[PDB]
Write a protein that binds this DNA or RNA. Structure first.
Ligand SMILES: [Cl-]
Ligand SMILES: [Cl-]
Ligand SMILES: [Cl-]
Ligand SMILES: [Cl-]
Ligand SMILES: [Cl-]
Ligand SMILES: [Cl-]
Ligand SMILES: [Cl-]
Ligand SMILES: [K+]
Ligand SMILES: [Mg+2]
Ligand SMILES: [Mg+2]
Ligand SMILES: [Mg+2]
Ligand SMILES: [Mg+2]
Ligand SMILES: [Mg+2]
Ligand SMILES: [Mg+2]
Ligand SMILES: [Mg+2]
Ligand SMILES: [Mg+2]
Ligand SMILES: [Mg+2]
Ligand SMILES: [Mg+2]
Ligand SMILES: [Mg+2]
Ligand SMILES: [Mg+2]
Ligand SMILES: [Mg+2]
Ligand SMILES: [Mg+2]
Ligand SMILES: [Mg+2]
Ligand SMILES: [Mg+2]
Ligand SMILES: [Mg+2]
Ligand SMILES: [Mg+2]
Ligand SMILES: [Mg+2]
Ligand SMILES: [Mg+2]
Ligand SMILES: [Mg+2]
Ligand SMILES: [Mg+2]
Ligand SMILES: [Mg+2]
Ligand SMILES: [Mg+2]
Ligand code: NA
Ligand code: NA
Ligand code: NA
Ligand code: NA
Ligand code: NA
Ligand code: NA
Ligand code: NA
Ligand code: NA
Ligand code: NA
Ligand code: NA
Ligand code: NA
Ligand code: NA
Ligand code: NA
Ligand code: NA
Ligand code: NA
Ligand code: NA
Ligand code: NA
Ligand code: NA
Ligand code: NA
Ligand code: NA
Ligand code: NA
Ligand code: NA
Lengths: 337, 156, 142, 132, 172
RNA sequence: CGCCACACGGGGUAAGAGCUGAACGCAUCUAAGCUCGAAACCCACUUGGAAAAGAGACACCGCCGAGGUCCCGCGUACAAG
RNA sequence: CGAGUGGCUUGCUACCUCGAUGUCGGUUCCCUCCAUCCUGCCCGUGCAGAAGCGGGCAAGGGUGAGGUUGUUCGCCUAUUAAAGGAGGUCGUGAGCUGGGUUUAGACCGUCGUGAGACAGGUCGGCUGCUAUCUACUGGGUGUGUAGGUGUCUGACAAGA
RNA sequence: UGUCCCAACGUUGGGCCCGGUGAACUGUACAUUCCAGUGCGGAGUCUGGAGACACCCAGGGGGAAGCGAAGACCCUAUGGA
RNA sequence: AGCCUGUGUACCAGGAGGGGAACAACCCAGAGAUAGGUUAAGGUCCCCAAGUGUGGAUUAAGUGUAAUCCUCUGAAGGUGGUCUCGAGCCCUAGACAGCCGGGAGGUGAGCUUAGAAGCAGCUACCCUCUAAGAAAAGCGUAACAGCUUACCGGCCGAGGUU
């Protein structure tokens, strides 16, 4: 009869090709609810350890009790909104209008950009306001970049640059909010955007694995029984029926696996601190020591240690926030042994 | 078996019993119904007219007639009316039931050849046309589309 | 941006096919055409069925592909492509010298071609390309 | 059912031979099915702690042998994870024959029982000698 | 064909394009009367529905436009009212108007409150076990009334036994 | 075999429940119009995506110099590339 | 009784291949159909409720594990929301398997004077090839758009 | 007891890159195809559409009714043994 | 049966060229080379040469835009979808429908039956008042009551019904 069975692997994360930017790019942003604010931040993955927590869930029969929870440590030092980009609404979607930059630049931002030497901030600002007057102003986002230098364990000094949306009350109000952030020096921090307890969406470029078989890549079976000894162990039965006489792209085949962007949904921010309270004895394997601004993320995060990961207020949360959870213990035990 | 296998008048006329044997008996019970003691001395005379030349197996004739006369008991087992099915299943029909080798079939039944426009049924009624209904049920069991034609009756 | 159209046609309340037919004829005669207010062009019939036809076209496909437009933009243009030997040198030239637009990006109001205008007063069974596109899932950028 | 209050890695399969932790007269039990469980092509139906399984008596009193009863998984060799992170495993795999209402067919439960089993099968629990 | 509707002294009816508006002491209602080759217009003291065709489909609409307009005259003067009656057998059903939508609570003991949104300038005045839906736009009232009765629809069980619910007692 | 994450809600519909309503003074869920209504459809969400031949946008840097390749030490990458 | 639709079965035909289109069952992996087994929304009821029975829309998802048999089918167990059916050269041997079918050996029964025969049964009995083209999975070099860096847009495409 | 649930990790030789050596199979022509249709009824080449910038590397083998063998089955021959 | 087997005939075979999307035998057409011209079949919105031709009508299903056909399906049965033509009857002495009013008494007929009163069954179905009104056509009740049909009048105003 041939029993039924779901297909192997999702056809939603394709094509399974190597990512274009190691730095993730959100294709979604939260809704314009609260007061004006930057809708995202970034850090650099460091590692894992567990934390003991007080059951924060009001519906848990264990609410108030001890509870061990896995946590991935992420160094989230301050970042810098170096300019405000404006978009206009056109018959072909949104298009970048202009940009308002600054003069105070991080000593090493030029390892990536051809830093500006002559820019007219006001004119840009004007152009934007005239577009808003005309009513063609599309959302507003800030060009942001990180300060790798600020993170010793991470070799790179060349900053990673990524655009982040600014959703606020009115457009006029948040437009201003934008300009103000920028004008200063763009300097902002995880505290300014997130609060321990809230849910965030963590994007990242997964750990690369090179070319792999379908078994690993799509999760197809290995030849079973007598079939496994005939000369085929990890190759599927066939590439398709006789007709249509062509191999469909839906059939699991070998290829690039890993080093793909993924936006993992609803990640609870256990704690946002600073210092070396989360670091492990011996140091974070293949990473280093943590002693500065950090975020503790519940569970796992895509990517290997040292990789840049991006945060964003969960766009589709299931639970209501349960602010500042009681941390009763953070394990610093060595990750070697 | 289906009417499809015998409803067309495409074969030769095959009726000479002097050369055909083992012909099954007709299922048609009667041809004259109602008050057959009386003669067509009725005010109204409706007829069921076949609209296409076809072959009707005795099967269909019986089923048609029954369904009509059985219904004409809206008038009663000894009601005042006379019903007549004027056609008889003369045409013997075969079936090749070896493959196409020596395929002249064996007698399996009979059918009546009616030509478009002939009346297959004629009923005689007093202004009490329940017969018109007896025929909407009758042509329901014969291949062709049919015309319910009223003759002596300008009592509309 | 900037299209020296020798002719600017206005599709508003005009029968797409009939317009498209005339635009191809001219583009083949060398004329540079631009169609305006595509979102407002119309096609007669029973909306329900009409939509079915187009939704099907969107769904038809495979590895080789069958790219079908959902914007009233594309829709109108592909319609015109069907009226030209778009694979022959001459036909690609003509097709290429034709462009459709959402609304009217010119100063001049385009012209309405003979026998392509539909009378809303004596016609209730018809559809707007834009309505179609909204149903297809297009993003109403107009 | 009700949350077990612990994450389980089924340690049993359809056809597994376990211990009958009670005085019903049934010594060895053979798993036949798992209540409320549907698997997936080629996968053997798996059972673990706190699962109500269908069983057949392999060993025991002639009168109890070959009988198809219903039971509950009181102990397993494969570890299970409690909320505080710790793991818990037992010395063997065991189940206690139960009836329609989930009341131990027997009178006394031999050997210990996971606590988690309590939160699901009261009458079984309230019959336990030792509850870890 | 052509029908002439003398408008009530109490009323004023204006119209531009395919949209007609009727205003009275009781309110103002605007509608679209759009059909192939049927022209509606306001000739001073009378509204005119005329068309050059006389086929069934057309006569159908002309006739429909007539009752539509006449109905509007009445809405802007006397108005429209539907009366309803709340009824329960075991659970005391609580019907309340909250905001722009009537809410029903404890229907058949349900914890979750059932609700529907009122249409237009429809007034739903509730007094005890009697409701009164009223307004100038017959279309809006009729629906709001209906919607209300519909709100207690039950498909799961025998209606003959479970009869709880609000119902239309009087139709204008 | 371990651990983390993977909605809701809008929009339009089918079957269906209705509203107003005429042909046909009445009646009528339909003929014109309207309100609802499926795990299905569209959006939402995730992934890819300037080779989209209408081959795109913005900011800055540069055209005797901006930037890049090779080179060297290595990998968060990798069968060559 | 009458009218049909489908192209799963069987039969018929002898159009296509005998300078060979590798025949069953199974397995693996992919897509599809709806005449819908479950799941969603509904109608009727000989609809109190609960459990059903029949019918409508509907193919998004699911439709599983085992005992005998090569078996398909089916018989049987226990689970299950349900453990639906069918198409893709009765999908799938340049993928597997080789139990069966179907060679050469042999036995039994039946038939035959005999050689030997039987869609009767039974034990044993082989699975070739370094991919030119095309197709697709992934990976690169170039050209076009017409100096560079960084950030984007989004026609369309995939998803359960 | 890794036959299976259900696969993982590791070892050795290959595989991949480089120097040297250096065949064979196969080839009417053309050839970037895909969906349909049609045709001696099983088409990369016909018809209609869709898609398609060129070249190259690796792969597992869907198709070329792939390559290999003038079918062993079946029938025919006033064939053979 | 794109089956088998006759027969007469034209065709393909062995027949180009034009049309038919493609296509031995369907349509035009039987053809020396070259050239001008006019037609045939078929076609005149575009692809694509020629009409977005004229008078008039129907269809709202994208029916259809499919001569022939393995190839283009669609049947019995059904349709107050819509258009056209006819016949009969009724009507400004006011029709058809709707709404209002009336639907009366002898009498709750006789008979049967505890009972029966229009209406369980059986028989009969008479006469008065009147502008109407059954010894009751349909519900309803244990039987009554109650609700309506028939029948009459009014309101309304034009065609209506078969
Ligand atoms: Cl296998
Ligand atoms: Cl596609
Ligand atoms: Cl072309
Ligand atoms: Cl219309
Ligand atoms: Cl099982
Ligand atoms: Cl000749
Ligand atoms: Cl169409
Ligand atoms: K052959
Ligand atoms: Mg082998
Ligand atoms: Mg460790
Ligand atoms: Mg340890
Ligand atoms: Mg299996
Ligand atoms: Mg029920
Ligand atoms: Mg082959
Ligand atoms: Mg169906
Ligand atoms: Mg599907
Ligand atoms: Mg096969
Ligand atoms: Mg199969
Ligand atoms: Mg092989
Ligand atoms: Mg193969
Ligand atoms: Mg091979
Ligand atoms: Mg064998
Ligand atoms: Mg064997
Ligand atoms: Mg054998
Ligand atoms: Mg082509
Ligand atoms: Mg041969
Ligand atoms: Mg032989
Ligand atoms: Mg011999
Ligand atoms: Mg010849
Ligand atoms: Mg032309
Ligand atoms: Mg059609
Ligand atoms: Mg025909
Ligand atoms: Na091998
Ligand atoms: Na091997
Ligand atoms: Na094959
Ligand atoms: Na024979
Ligand atoms: Na018939
Ligand atoms: Na159209
Ligand atoms: Na498509
Ligand atoms: Na919806
Ligand atoms: Na480009
Ligand atoms: Na058929
Ligand atoms: Na051959
Ligand atoms: Na097989
Ligand atoms: Na389905
Ligand atoms: Na079996
Ligand atoms: Na085959
Ligand atoms: Na093989
Ligand atoms: Na096989
Ligand atoms: Na092993
Ligand atoms: Na191949
Ligand atoms: Na000839
Ligand atoms: Na031709
Ligand atoms: Na069509």
């Amino acid at each position: 009869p041939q029993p039924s069975r779901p297909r192997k692997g999702s056809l939603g994360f394709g094509p399974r090709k190597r990512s274009t930017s190691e730095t993730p790019r959100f294709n979604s942003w939260p809704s314009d609810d609260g007061q004006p604010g930057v809708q995202g931040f970034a850090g650099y993955k460091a590692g894992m350890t567990h934390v003991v927590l007080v059951n924060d869930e009001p519906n848990s029969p264990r609410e108030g009790m001890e509870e061990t929870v896995p946590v991935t440590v992420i160094e989230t030092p301050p970042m810098r909104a170096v300019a405000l980009r404006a978009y206009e609404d056109t018959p072909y979607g949104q298009r970048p209008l202009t940009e308002v930059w600054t003069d105070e630049f991080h000593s090493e931002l030029d390892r990536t950009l051809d830093v500006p030497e002559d820019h007219d901030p006001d004119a840009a600002e004007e152009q934007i306001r005239d577009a808003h007057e005309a009513g063609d102003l599309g959302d507003l986002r800030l060009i942001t970049h990180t300060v790798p230098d600020a993170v010793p364990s991470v070799p790179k000094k060349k900053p990673d640059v990524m655009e982040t949306r600014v959703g606020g009350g009115s457009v006029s109000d948040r437009l201003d909010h934008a300009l103000d952030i920028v004008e200063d020096g763009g300097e902002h921090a995880m505290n300014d955007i997130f609060r321990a307890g809230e849910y965030a969406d963590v994007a990242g470029v997964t750990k690369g694995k090179g070319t792999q078989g379908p078994v690993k890549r799509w999760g197809v079976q290995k030849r079973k029984g007598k079939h496994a000894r005939q000369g085929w162990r990890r190759r599927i039965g066939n590439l398709g029926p006789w007709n249509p006489s062509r191999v469909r792209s839906t059939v699991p085949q070998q290829g690039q696996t890993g080093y793909h962007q993924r936006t993992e949904l609803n990640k609870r921010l256990i704690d946002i601190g600073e210092g070396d309270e989360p670091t492990v004895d011996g140091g974070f394997v293949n990473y280093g020591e943590v002693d500065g601004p950090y975020t503790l993320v519940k569970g796992s995060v895509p990517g290997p240690d040292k990789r840049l990961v991006r945060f964003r207020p969960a766009v589709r949360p299931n639970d209501q926030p349960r602010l500042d959870p009681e941390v009763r213990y953070v394990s610093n035990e060595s990750n070697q042994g | 078996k289906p009417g499809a296998m015998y409803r067309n008048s495409s074969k030769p006329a095959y009726t000479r019993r002097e050369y055909i044997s083992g012909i099954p008996g007709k299922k048609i019970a009667q041809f004259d119904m109602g008050n057959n003691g009386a003669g067509p001395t009725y005010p109204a005379q409706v007829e069921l007219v076949v609209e296409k030349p076809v072959q009707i197996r005795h099967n269909a004739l019986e089923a048609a007639r029954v369904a009509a006369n059985r219904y004409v008991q809206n008038s009663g087992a000894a009601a005042n009316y006379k019903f007549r099915i004027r056609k008889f299943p003369f045409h013997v029909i075969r079936e090749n039931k070896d493959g196409m080798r020596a395929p002249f079939g064996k007698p399996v039944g009979t059918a009546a050849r009616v030509h478009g426009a002939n009346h297959i049924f004629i009923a005689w009624v007093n202004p009490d046309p329940n017969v018109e209904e007896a025929w909407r049920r009758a042509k329901m069991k014969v291949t062709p589309t049919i015309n319910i034609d009223s003759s002596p009756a300008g009592n509309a | 941006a900037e299209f020296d159209a020798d002719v600017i046609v206005d599709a508003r309340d005009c029968i797409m096919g009939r317009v498209a037919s005339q635009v191809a004829e001219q583009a083949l005669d060398g004329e540079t055409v631009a169609v305006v207010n595509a979102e407002r062009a119309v096609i007669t019939g029973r909306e329900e069925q009409i939509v079915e036809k187009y939704e099907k076209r969107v769904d038809i496909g495979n590895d080789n592909g069958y790219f079908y437009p959902k914007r009233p933009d594309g829709i109108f243009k592909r319609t015109i492509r069907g009226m030209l030997p778009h694979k022959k040198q001459r036909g690609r030239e003509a097709f290429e010298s034709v462009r459709v637009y959402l609304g009217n990006p010119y100063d001049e109001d385009g012209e309405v071609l003979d026998g392509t205008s539909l009378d809303r007063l004596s016609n209730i069974k018809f559809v707007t390309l834009g309505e179609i596109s909204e149903t297809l899932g297009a993003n109403k950028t107009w | 059912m009700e949350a077990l209050g612990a994450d389980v890695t089924q340690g049993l399969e359809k056809g597994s031979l376990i211990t009958c932790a009670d005085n019903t007269g049934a010594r060895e039990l053979k798993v036949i099915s798992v209540h409320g469980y549907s698997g997936t092509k080629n996968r053997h139906p798996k059972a673990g702690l706190g699962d109500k399984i269908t069983v057949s008596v392999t060993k025991g009193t002639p009168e109890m042998r070959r009988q198809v009863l219903e039971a509950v998984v009181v102990r397993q060799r494969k570890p299970i994870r409690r909320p505080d992170g710790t793991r818990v495993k037992f010395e063997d795999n065991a189940a206690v024959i139960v009836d329609e209402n989930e009341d131990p067919r027997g009178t006394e439960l031999k050997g210990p029982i996971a606590r988690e089993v309590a939160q699901r099968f009261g009458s079984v629990a309230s019959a336990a000698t030792m509850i870890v | 064909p052509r029908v002439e509707l003398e408008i009530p002294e109490d009323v004023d009816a204006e119209q531009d394009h395919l949209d007609i508006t009727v205003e009275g002491d009781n309110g103002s209602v605007t509608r679209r009367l759009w059909y192939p080759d049927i022209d509606v217009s306001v000739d001073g003291d009378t509204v005119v529905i005329e068309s050059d065709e006389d086929n069934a489909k057309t006569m159908s609409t002309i006739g429909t436009f007539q009752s539509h307009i006449e109905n509007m005259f009445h809405g802007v003067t006397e108005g429209w009212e539907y009366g309803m009656e709340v009824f329960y057998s075991h659970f005391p059903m609580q019907v309340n108007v909250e905001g722009d939508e009537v809410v029903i609570e404890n229907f058949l003991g349900e914890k979750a409150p059932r609700r529907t949104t009122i249409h237009g300038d429809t007034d739903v005045e509730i007094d005890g076990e009697e409701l009164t839906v009223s307004g100038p736009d017959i279309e809006a009232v009729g629906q709001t009334a209906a919607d209300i009765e519909q709100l207690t629809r039950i498909n799961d069980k025998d209606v003959r036994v479970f009869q709880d619910g609000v119902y239309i007692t009087r139709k204008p």
